[PDB]
Every structure is written in C-alpha cells, then in structure tokens.
Amino acid sequence: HMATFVELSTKAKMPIVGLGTWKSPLGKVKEAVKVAIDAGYRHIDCAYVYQNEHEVGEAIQEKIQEKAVKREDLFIVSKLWPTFFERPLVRKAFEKTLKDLKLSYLDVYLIHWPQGFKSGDDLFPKDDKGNAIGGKATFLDAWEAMEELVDEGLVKALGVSNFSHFQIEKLLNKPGLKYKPVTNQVECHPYLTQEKLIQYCHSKGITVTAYSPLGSPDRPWAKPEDPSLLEDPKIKEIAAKHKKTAAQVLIRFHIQRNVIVIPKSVTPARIVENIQVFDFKLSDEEMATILSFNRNWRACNVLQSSHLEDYPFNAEY
Template sequence: MASTTFLTLPSGKRMPQLGLGTWLSPPGIVQGAIEFAIKNGYRHIDCAYLYENEQAIGEGFAKVLKECPVKRDELFITSKLWNAYHAPEDVKPACMESMKMLQLDYLDLYLMHSPMSIKNVKGELMPQKDGKILQTDVDYVDTWKAMEKLVDEGLVKSIGVANFNKCQLERLISAARIKPDVLQVERHPFQTQKTLVAFTKSKGMAMTAYSPLTSPESPFLSGLKNGMEEPVVKEIAKKHGKSPAQILIRFNIQCGIATIPKSQTPAHIIENTKVFDFCLTDEEMKKLESLHCGARAVPWDLLGLGTHKHYPFSKDE
C-alpha cells in the first residue's frame, strides 16, 4: 500500500483508515485474500464470528506472519461478539473462541455485533422455532460491562459496537466505564448515516463503514442498487480517472471514516488502496450524499430481528 492514514481512537490506539472486509469471503478463498492483502500493505483486517470463516482467516494470519517481515503488533485485527453470546457469562468464551480460530493471543478491537440478543443454542448461529429467530432480552449494557473486563484482562485492546442507533449509543456511553472506541455501521451514498456521523464526531469516537461498495454480492439486495453501477458514481469516476469502487471508498475516507471494502481478487485488493492520491470536490461529495435513500445491503429486519426490543433501525433512516 503506497500510503494510508490512521484514525486515533478515544483510548489512544491508532486504527488504519483502510482495511479489508471479510464478510461473504468463503473458507478456501479468504486465506489467499488475507495473505495477499497483508503482503501488499494492508494492516487492518475486519472479521466476525458470524462470517463463519475465522478458522480460515487464522490460517492465513499464521502463514503470513511466519513468511513475511510483518509483526503482529503492526496489524489491527477486529472481531465481533455475535448476538447469541450477549449473556455476560458467554462474552469471554465467545471472544476466546474467535481468538483461538484466528490464532491470536489478543484482538485490537472487539465489537458487539448488534444490540439485539438471541438465544444461545449450541451449533446454531440463528436458532429458530416455527420459522422465527429465538430472541432474548439481555440488556446490551450488561453485555458491554462483560466486554470491559476483556480489556482489563488484556485480551482486547479496544472495544466498540456495531449497528447501534444514536439513542442506544447515548445510553451505553452514560453507563460505560470504558467508553466505546468505534461504531461500525453500513455506510455508502445510499445510506449516509448523517445523524450517527455527527454524533460519533461529537463524542470523539471513530466510525467504520461496512459495505462501502454497497455489497453487490449480498443476498439481501432487494431494495439496494449496485453503487458501482450508479450513473453519478460512474461520472465522477470517469472525471478522476478512477474506478467506481475507488470513488465509493474515497467517499468515506474523505469524511474521516474508516472503510473496509471486501475483495477476494488480487487486482481489486490493490486497486482499493489507491484512494489517497486524489480528492473529491465539495460539489462531488454533495452529489454523492444526495443519493441517500435509506437503503441497506444488510437489512436486519429480513434476518428476522425487526421485532426485537433492541432493534436499532427506523424506517426513515
């Protein structure tokens, strides 16, 4: 990677602003993507227990750290606590399981994947009965307090949350002993997260944008266009001599937001890093922001959680 920038977290830790996402990267392919990315300068890798590929990612980490002159402390590795492990007694075992699969003895960042808890049924990511996910009402503040202990024990350097709304963040921050360093949310021109961007900045928190390319491979794309086919994006890309993907990544980078585009293709992995040698004009940024329509690549209501008491999204977002 020719160049990159870093975001300083409230805890004082530094997070590379550009990372590699791993959602929808299957085992057997993700190892090679991880190895190639790290060999070509990536230092921020975003993972999650939900993605069911942490074992394979761990094999990639082990190989690249053995073969390349890259030290563990040069990497910034994120994983996420899945919804089934919100009960305080389940938090540490879940974290340890991810660390074991990733072949790491600490995580740089551990995120609560969402504020919504579901039943912990061994071997099932989304346990169901009569076609409905088995929800529970564990308070995410109690989950957070268990996550704070992970920091105390040195298992995790930083903690944060994903898919929280402003009210939930305010409540969590008011109750937290260790304030969240990062909020990870879906963000792209179709979902600009204006309220959350302003709120996190006011609190000094960092934001990470997932699905910055609108996740065209998402199985939930019922109401979202492929952002790389959007005429406004293609027009701006042509003007700058860049790809539509690079414009979508730059859209977040230029807002001071960390961005984790997923790719398995070597050429695209390298292409996605070439976003620090140009700037979008104010007019171009406004054009991209005007595309906001509230659409999501990951609509959690379609996952069967729209009725959860801690469901974070409103229809007007």
C-alpha cells in the same frame, strides 16, 4: 499503500481502509488476507459469525512468520454475535475467535448487533415462522463481560456495531461503565450517508466504520431492481474523470469524511485496487454531489429481527 490513520479516543491508530471478510469463502479468504497484507492492508475486519476466522488466522500467522508484517502494525477487529451475550458465553465466544485468529490480543472487539438472540446451539434461533427469538441477556450485560477482556489485556478497545444514537446513549449512561466504545461500525455509502449518526458519534469521540461501502452486491438477498452503487452512472462519471474505478470512488468518499471503511473482496486484483485510494481526491463539489445521493437505503435492514427490543433501525438515527 499505507492507509492513513484515524485516531481513536484511546490514542491508538486505526487504519482508515481495512479488508472485509463477510462472505469470503473458506478456500479463498486465506489468500485474500495474504494478498491484502502484501498490498499494504493492516486492518482486517472479522467476525465469529463469518465462520472463517481460522483461515484469516492462518494468513496472519504465516505473514508474521515470513517477516512480511509485525503484529503491532496489524489492526484486527472481531465481533461478539448476539447469541452470546450471557456472561459465560461472552468469554467462550471471544476465546474461540482469538484461538481461531491465532492472536494474543484483538485491537477492537465489537458488539456485532444490539438486539440479543436466544442462546443455544443455533446461530440464528427462529420464532415459528422465522423471525428472530430474543435472548435473556442484553448488550449491556455483554458489555460488562467484554470490559473484563480490556482489563486482562486481551482486547485493546471495545466498540459497537449497528447501534443507533439512543443505544450509544444507553451504553454511555450505564452505571459503572468502565470502557467507552471507540467506534460504531454501521452501513454507510452514498445511498445511506448517515449524516446525523456520524455527527453524533464524532461529537462523542466515537469513530465510524462504514460497512457494505460498495453496496454489498454479493449479499444473498440482492434483487436486480435494488439500488446498485457500483453501476451508478453518476458515480461512474466521477470515477471516469479521475481514471479510477467506481469502487475506488466509493471508498474514497468515506476517507474524506474521516470515516473508516472496510470493502470486502476475495479477488486479488480488486483487493489491490481497493487500497489505491490515497493518490487522488474528490473535489468539494464531487463530495457534495455524492452526499446528495442519500436514499435512506439499507442493504442490511435485517427485518427478521425488527420485533426485538433493541432492533436499531426504528430510530431516526
């Protein structure tokens, strides 16, 4: 199935469902991407910190070599991790991502998190204790380096992730800004419906990409008492009606809000199921019901970074 597009401010077309790759093992992610491309996926969400981009790259190159897909029809997103915000490190980190992915360009390159981390060998540099150690460079510094990539044709568009509206304002207000973000990739699902942030982003011509749309049940820190979207009986009730799965309803929820969504799986049958979401529709009542489930609950609150200056989640939205 071909996912529907969401038009970006650049007029590029971003497929509304993509494949997530956080936690996808080296040993499984290459097959996951191959299965996804065969099943009609064109958008793949990647990151340097996921430490699996080289296997994603192998999958894409092989599919292009087998004439299963053309590069112009793929939509590949990656992200700049916050230990690489210093000018020279932006370029080096990008170059490693691009080399690993075996691509000539990225469709979108995101600021992964706004709050900067100390540069050095460690991906997760620690206080003592282990709250995050902050960095010298800020996301505004990083953005300027990222703009170079767009000028040089290495990236078609920039975006942000885990930004509050205040942080988007800071960016949009930056003197000498060359490129505006095309998306804000944030956690979004029926327990964190992001009404105000989505309103704000859309009002600025910025799309929203919903991460952890199934509640990230495989996040390492899940506790059995934590909210569970996939086992929510009211979600299951609405799925059963449609003869669909819970997952499919959780994905379709975003589509109907014109929000891009990136469910992760390495299980072939689930990869295929998760893009089977364009032949049913949730009713207005069903959408209103699911919207009403908001709990302000984050699977990814990253509280160890909450003392850093640009920690995003102290703002209302």
